[PDB]
Amino acid sequence: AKETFYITTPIYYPSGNLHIGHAYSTVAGDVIARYKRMQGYDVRYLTGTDEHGQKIQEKAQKAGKTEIEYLDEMIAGIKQLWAKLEISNDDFIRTTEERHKHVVEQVFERLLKQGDIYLGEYEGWYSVPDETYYTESQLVDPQYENGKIIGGKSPDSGHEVELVKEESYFFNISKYTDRLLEFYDQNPDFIQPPSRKNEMINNFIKPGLADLAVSRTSFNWGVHVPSNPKHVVYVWIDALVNYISALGYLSDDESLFNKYWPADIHLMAKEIVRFHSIIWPILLMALDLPLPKKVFAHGWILMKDGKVVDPNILIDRYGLDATRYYLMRELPFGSDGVFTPEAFVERTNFDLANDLGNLVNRTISMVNKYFDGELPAYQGPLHELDEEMEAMALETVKSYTESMESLQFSVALSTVWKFISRTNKYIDETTPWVLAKDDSQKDMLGNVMAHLVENIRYAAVLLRPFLTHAPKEIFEQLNINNPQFMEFSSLEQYGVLNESIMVTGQPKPIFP
Numbered sequence: 001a002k003e004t005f006y007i008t009t010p011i012y013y014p015s016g017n018l019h020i021g022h023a024y025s026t027v028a029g030d031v032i033a034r035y036k037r038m039q040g041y042d043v044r045y046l047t048g049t050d051e052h053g054q055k056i057q058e059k060a061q062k063a064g065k066t067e068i069e070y071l072d073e074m075i076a077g078i079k080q081l082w083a084k085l086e087i088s089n090d091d092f093i094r095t096t097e098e099r100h101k102h103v104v105e106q107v108f109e110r111l112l113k114q115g116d117i118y119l120g121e122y123e124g125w126y127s128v129p130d131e132t133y134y135t136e137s138q139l140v141d142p143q144y145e146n147g148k149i150i151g152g153k154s155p156d157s158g159h160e161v162e163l164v165k166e167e168s169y170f171f172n173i174s175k176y177t178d179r180l181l182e183f184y185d186q187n188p189d190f191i192q193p194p195s196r197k198n199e200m201i202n203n204f205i206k207p208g209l210a211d212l213a214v215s216r217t218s219f220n221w222g223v224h225v226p227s228n229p230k231h232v233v234y235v236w237i238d239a240l241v242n243y244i245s246a247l248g249y250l251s252d253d254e255s256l257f258n259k260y261w262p263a264d265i266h267l268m269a270k271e272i273v274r275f276h277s278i279i280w281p282i283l284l285m286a287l288d289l290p291l292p293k294k295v296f297a298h299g300w301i302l303m304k305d306g307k308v309v310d311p312n313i314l315i316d317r318y319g320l321d322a323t324r325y326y327l328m329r330e331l332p333f334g335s336d337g338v339f340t341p342e343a344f345v346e347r348t349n350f351d352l353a354n355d356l357g358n359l360v361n362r363t364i365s366m367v368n369k370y371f372d373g374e375l376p377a378y379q380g381p382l383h384e385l386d387e388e389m390e391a392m393a394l395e396t397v398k399s400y401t402e403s404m405e406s407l408q409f410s411v412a413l414s415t416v417w418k419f420i421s422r423t424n425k426y427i428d429e430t431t432p433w434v435l436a437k438d439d440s441q442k443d444m445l446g447n448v449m450a451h452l453v454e455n456i457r458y459a460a461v462l463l464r465p466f467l468t469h470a471p472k473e474i475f476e477q478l479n480i481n482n483p484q485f486m487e488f489s490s491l492e493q494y495g496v497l498n499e500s501i502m503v504t505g506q507p508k509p510i511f512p
């Protein structure tokens, strides 16, 4: 049948206001999903939210709300954003749903019966704003009193770390140390980019995998341990199983789970890769489940010094295509990006409105002026330049694909704009207005317009994963009504338009 592809975003904390960093994660996963659906995969694209823990409970407590009411309100605004960004997620998984909660209970009960989980006491440091256990030496701005650390802050968030000293269940992750290390030997590509692996092994595995405190006795808000209801399951164990619980794991019908698991990519930001690539594999080893194929960790979007840009405000001012394009263009593979408002409008006005927007405008006007809208049919590479430009178009599809497969979206986008820049330069080289003056050069004039439009069609098809408005408008104004000419397989042979087409007599702007 159709080959499967399962890609996931991380499930986010409904903590206040989403930022372009979480919008990047969701837009990039959508670009993957849309891209894979265009290639003829059976794609499942999952996102969701992380609703349990002390952090969320304190936020709802501070708000003067219940957890569900506070959550329901935050989740409503999160989903408002995804609908506006136009995310093609096949499912949305909330951890407060019983279809999730029952899987967390059964996974915990099972690990207890295996002897993988045992009871004890965690003493040490914890950042509730990070939901992360820390050791003495990991603390930032530590407090020494008679040679002993009695306080500090989190290296991630910079928030004050608090002392934990309570009864807790421990997942024996220490005994999977060599098996996880052997997994990295067999599968060195597991973490993409590979540059993020060695720091993560050096910081988190080398000093010794301490057993992970996987339950909590102090707070109330979370999945309760069924054998011992006073214990509430740790948020990160609770959260991690959303990728399998949403597929119907440990239900009557695991047909969706057998189909889509293991996941092809787990997409995330670089500060939560330790959970998905140490704990998440060790956990699946304990459940005897096949591990993920990739864990793509992307960089941050900095603010000219360090890390309050609202996606909503960008979409309202400059449109969706501008905001979506900017995100994928300005964050490279293995790098962080800077948001500057100057950089944003340059990318919106010069790349979209001018380079692509005015290419379609220049082309359609010349077809209206020189042929009254009747765009001539494609014959062949009749012009001197056509042969290497047609090869350029097929190399653009080739190079783009290689960039899309290795998760280099800014390089694929720069490759496509190289081609759009060429197509604009083709107007300057051919000088169609000089061909229009001669009656014997009508055949060559029509060749240039047909190549102009076929170059645009190539670009619009390649931008369908990235841009959800522009290609669709481009086909309407050009009057390309065949939905097969909007697919990737129509780019295999240049010059698909063999019958003439009546283009629009009222060309309107593609971009706002």
Ligand code: MET
Residues within 6 Å of the ligand: 010, 011, 012, 013, 050, 239, 240, 241, 242, 272
């Ligand atoms: C299993 S992914 C959990 C991610 C977590 N909610 C975060 O915001 O970092």
